[PDB]
From Swiss-Prot:
The gene is PRP6. It comes from the Eukaryota. This is Pre-mRNA-splicing factor 6. Present with 2250 molecules/cell in log phase SD medium. HAT repeats lie at residues 1-30. The chain holds residues 651 to 700 of 899 of the full protein. Participates in pre-mRNA splicing. Part of the U4/U5/U6 tri-snRNP complex, one of the building blocks of the spliceosome. Disulfide bonds: none annotated. It is found in: Nucleus.
Length: 50
């Protein structure tokens, strides 16, 4: 759970990278919350198509 905040903050600011999104998704999967993970993935796609 302590990851998420950092991801929300630091990834958003400077890097804006795909790997981060993937990591987040993985984390979500690990702790159930599938819908949330899906949403995150979608967001990532929207932001970084390639």
């Amino acid at each position: 759970e302590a990851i998420k905040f950092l991801n929300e903050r630091c990834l958003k600011s400077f890097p804006i990278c795909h790997k981060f999104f993937l990591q987040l998704g993985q984390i979500y999967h690990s702790m159930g919350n599938i819908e949330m993970s899906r949403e995150t993935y979608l967001s990532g796609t929207r932001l970084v198509p390639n």
